[PDB]
């Protein structure tokens, strides 16, 4: 019942006038908000999105982060200045925070953060440090960001206390969205696959929730081990797509069935023959 | 934390060359140019982050500035005008928020 | 402008107290300084205030921070003749060199000998 809870940020800087931050935040594999450049404010995508807080603490969180959007895009692009010729744009900035939530109060918060797409910088304990492959300029960066006492101190707040309980909050208030289950409707289909007289069968299974499920292809009740299984694919309302596939000889396709096990299903397997 | 800058007083011509330098000798990375003028607030005019960088303040038109070494930060007026008689104010810096100020150079610009 | 400072000027006779206000709309907030400026001189600080709801104190000059209503007293007790001067307000945005600095035009006191 491990749930981890994210919030990803995306900057753009193309020059040194143009730039926008763009956030999403997660919980586990759900959508909770939503935050445009073009939008003042922090968007739910869910009904229990403001978990637990009160209208009241929800604003003052929400202007904390108003107040960081305006200044982080200042900072950075006083950074690039103070590195010049040194770094230039275009840049991308990445911001990978929040807090993996254990049984019995139990969690590790977290802020990483990505420089031109590699992991360079985190927040750990008290201060900025880079991590290891992190290039070395980045050490006046760091050295101007853990002289903001003020910062350091606000950040250890919202890592160590604000984290954990909003999504303790979350868990409860959105308990039947994330329990919710959703059945996967399957369906076969075949195609040829670049060799001399073999086709590729292939199970689609699509509308699963939650995520873990298993498809196997089966002559009777033995399980091929041919079958290799795609990445899992999200579908637009929050179900997962997947599809497994089987090489096999033309004319013996006779014979095979795909059989799909879910939680949804209560026992009830999909069986789907040629 | 000491800065000086000289010259602390110049009388110039309209479109005479005047050149205001600030000295530091306390290996800051950081130095700031403003201006003081009666019925406003100092405001910035060029910062620098070191050695080779100048970048612009908030009112840079008519200034060029030069960091050509940590120690020494200048501002260059290539043609002074009589908007500019004012009172300058160099500070350094490092990475902490404090300003370290001069005393000041008083700039009179005649026709 | 971002930081306002009231009274303009005051007179006030030797031994008298006086109060000088800053209101400011600069955000963030990071801290706020108090600067004493002699006539054709430069900037001597007088105290910093940081923390939401701060106090300050040094020798006959005392000062208040509110930093929800974005409000700076400075008090100076029993006026002296050298408090003569121009006392300023400063609001940097930032608690490292990535700060900007907002400066307020200033109050001029008078001291009466």
């Known amino acids: 019942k491990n749930y981890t809870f994210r919030c990803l940020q995306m900057s753009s800087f193309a020059n040194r006038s143009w730039s926008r931050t763009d956030s999403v935040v997660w919980l586990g594999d759900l959508q909770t908000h939503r935050w445009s450049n073009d939008s003042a404010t922090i968007s739910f995508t869910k009904p229990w999105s403001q978990g637990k807080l009160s209208n009241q603490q929800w604003e003052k969180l929400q202007h904390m982060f108003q107040v960081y959007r305006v200044s982080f895009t200042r900072d950075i692009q006083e950074l690039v200045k103070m590195m010049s010729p040194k770094e230039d744009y275009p840049i991308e900035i990445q911001l990978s925070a929040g807090c993996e939530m254990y049984p019995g109060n139990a969690s590790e918060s977290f802020l990483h953060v990505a420089f031109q797409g590699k992991y360079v910088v985190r927040f750990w304990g008290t201060s900025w440090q880079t991590v290891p492959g992190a290039p070395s300029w980045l050490d006046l960066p760091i050295k101007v960001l853990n002289a903001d006492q003020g910062t350091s101190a606000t950040v250890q707040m919202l890592l160590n206390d604000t984290c954990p309980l909003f999504v303790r909050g979350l868990l409860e208030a959105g308990k039947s969205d994330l329990e919710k289950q959703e059945k996967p409707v399957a369906w076969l289909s075949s195609v040829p696959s670049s060799a001399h007289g073999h086709r590729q069968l292939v199970c689609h299974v699509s509308g699963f929730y939650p995520k873990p499920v298993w498809v196997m292809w089966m002559r009777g009740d033995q399980e091929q081990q041919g079958t290799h299984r795609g990445d899992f694919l999200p579908n637009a309302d929050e179900t997962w797509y997947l599809q497994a596939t089987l090489d096999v000889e033309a004319g013996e396709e006779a014979g095979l069935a795909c059989r799909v096990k879910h939680s949804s299903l209560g026992g009830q397997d999909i069986i789907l023959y040629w | 934390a000491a800065v000086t800058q000289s010259p602390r007083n110049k009388v110039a011509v309209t479109g005479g060359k005047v050149t205001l330098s600030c000295n530091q000798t306390?290996?800051?990375?950081?130095m700031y140019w403003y201006r003081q003028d009666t019925g406003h607030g100092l405001r910035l005019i060029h910062y620098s982050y070191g050695a080779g960088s100048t970048e612009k303040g908030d009112i840079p038109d008519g200034y060029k500035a030069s960091r050509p070494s940590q120690e020494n930060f200048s501002l260059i007026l290539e043609l002074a005008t009589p908007s500019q008689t004012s009172v300058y104010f160099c500070?350094?810096?490092?990475?902490?928020?404090?300003?370290?100020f001069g005393p000041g150079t008083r700039l009179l610009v005649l026709e | 402008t971002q930081v306002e400072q009231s009274p303009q000027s005051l007179v006030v006779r030797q031994g008298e107290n006086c109060v000088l206000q800053?209101?400011?709309?600069?955000?963030?907030?990071?801290?706020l300084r108090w600067f004493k400026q002699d006539t054709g001189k430069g900037l001597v600080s007088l105290t910093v205030?940081?923390?939401?709801?701060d106090k300050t104190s040094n020798g006959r000059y005392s000062a208040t921070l509110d930093k929800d209503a974005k409000h700076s007293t400075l008090h100076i007790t029993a006026t002296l003749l050298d408090d003569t001067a121009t006392y300023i307000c400063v609001v940097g945005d930032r608690g490292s060199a990535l700060g900007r600095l907002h400066f307020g035009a200033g109050t001029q006191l008078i001291v009466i000998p």
């Open positions: 500070a350094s810096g490092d990475e902490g928020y404090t300003q370290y």
């Open positions: 800053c209101n400011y709309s600069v955000t963030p907030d990071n801290h």
């Open positions: 205030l940081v923390d939401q709801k």
């Open positions: 306390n290996n800051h990375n950081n």
